[PDB]
Ligand binder design. Sequence first.
Ligand SMILES: [Zn+2]
Ligand SMILES: [Zn+2]
Ligand SMILES: [Zn+2]
Lengths: 31, 31, 31
Amino acid sequence: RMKQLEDKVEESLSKVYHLENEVARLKKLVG
Amino acid sequence: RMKQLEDKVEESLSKVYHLENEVARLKKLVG
Amino acid sequence: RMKQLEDKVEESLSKVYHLENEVARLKKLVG
Ligand SMILES: [Zn+2]
Ligand SMILES: [Zn+2]
Ligand SMILES: [Zn+2]
């Protein structure tokens, strides 16, 4: 379970980091 | 405690997957 | 270690919520 939890939260931060980059670009392109 | 963490972890991951979907749609819509 | 995982999960959720608000604003202004 601990591995399971560490892996899922890592995955979460990695995808969150990536979406922040995408949102930052859309924001610039937009208004 | 560990169980309530898993709960938050799985919830965060689900919302991240949804956001990915929202962002793919926005990137296409905005171009 | 449990506390580091809890910090990470909370940061993960904070970012997620924040991205939901950013996406929500983009969608309202996009159209
Ligand atoms: Zn992407
Ligand atoms: Zn949505
Ligand atoms: Zn922001």
